[PDB]
Design a protein around this ligand. Structure first.
Ligand code: HEC
Length: 86
């Protein structure tokens, strides 16, 4: 996984709803470490599955992003959650 490529994917695909690690559509479901842990989403496998397939109003990216790009953005988010958002 390549977090730097991940940041690029995040800017292009995720910041519309998750700028600042927030969630503009479902406010408590943020990208902060504490929230990812709380909801069982603090792992690459968990983020990949949800980004790929979607969940409620979290859009699915299967076929819109390549599998490796989904992997990269999951690594970014975990890194960011660890360093800056929490
Ligand atoms: C709005 C149009 C969104 C875009 C663009 C992306 N996400 Fe999202 N995300 C969105 C919602 C409404 C929710 C909550 C869904 C629910 O009902 O539970 C989510 C949730 C996530 C989560 C889970 C966060 C948590 O605290 O549990 C993750 C990890 C996540 N979203 C990641 C993510 C990525 C990497 C994105 C771009 C590729 C992305 N999301 C786009 C809404 C939207």
């Amino acid at each position: 996984a390549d977090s730097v490529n991940g940041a690029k994917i995040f800017s292009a695909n995720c910041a519309s709803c998750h700028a600042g690690g927030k969630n503009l559509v479902q406010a408590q479901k943020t990208l902060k470490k504490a929230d990812l842990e709380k909801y069982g989403m603090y792992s690459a496998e968990a983020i990949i599955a949800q980004v790929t397939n979607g969940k409620n109003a979290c859009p699915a990216f299967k076929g819109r992003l390549k599998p490796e790009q989904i992997e990269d953005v999951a690594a970014y988010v975990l890194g960011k959650a660890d360093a800056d958002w929490k």
